[PDB]
Nucleic acid binder design. Structure first.
Length: 175
DNA sequence: GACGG
DNA sequence: GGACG
């Protein structure tokens, strides 16, 4: 229902954009599992808010990257906003920032240098920065590393496609 | 502009 | 198994 994480997008749309237009415009980006136009309890009208759940986080991220800022109708004045949605549990409505989506955390052989890591992970997208966690006295690698990509979908692709022995997960922010 | 079926 | 002087 909510698996995998970061596979649901949050939309700020026109109150007059129906679910069918969301399906037509967002289905190219992946396997849609649920489209949900949020309606006001008292008027039963759209609040101008929607959720779209995709089968993969990479699909949700590509949808966000391509569709944020687009318009969906002639009567629509403002562009739509598309974010990765917060979970139902907790998630105090705060917008997920791109910095929380672009960096992955991997287990790697001790022999890897930062350029070895970049070589193995450049195939999933444009890498902004690679680092390896080392003993800062001796310089020896602790076998853990970070890869930050330019786009959230690139980090999602890496997590979904790289060898399972890397144990690739989204990296928590430092603070 | 944030949570149903 | 797992975290950034």
């Amino acid at each position: 229902s909510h698996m995998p994480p970061n596979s649901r997008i949050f939309l700020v749309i026109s109150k007059y954009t129906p679910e069918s237009v969301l399906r037509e415009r967002f289905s190219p980006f992946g396997d849609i599992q649920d489209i949900w136009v949020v309606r006001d309890k008292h008027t039963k009208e759209s609040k101008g808010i929607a959720f779209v759940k995709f089968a993969r986080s990479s699909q949700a991220c590509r949808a966000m990257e391509e569709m944020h800022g687009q318009c969906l109708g002639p009567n629509d004045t403002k562009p739509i906003k598309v974010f990765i949605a917060q979970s139902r549990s907790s998630g105090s409505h705060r917008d997920v920032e791109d910095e929380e989506l672009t960096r992955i955390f991997v287990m790697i052989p001790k022999s890897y240098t930062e350029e070895d890591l970049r070589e193995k992970f450049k195939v999933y997208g444009d890498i902004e920065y690679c680092s390896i966690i080392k003993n800062k006295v001796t310089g020896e690698s602790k076998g853990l590393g970070y890869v930050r990509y330019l786009k959230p979908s690139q980090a999602a692709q890496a997590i979904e496609n790289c060898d399972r022995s890397f144990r690739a997960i989204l990296a928590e922010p430092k603070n």
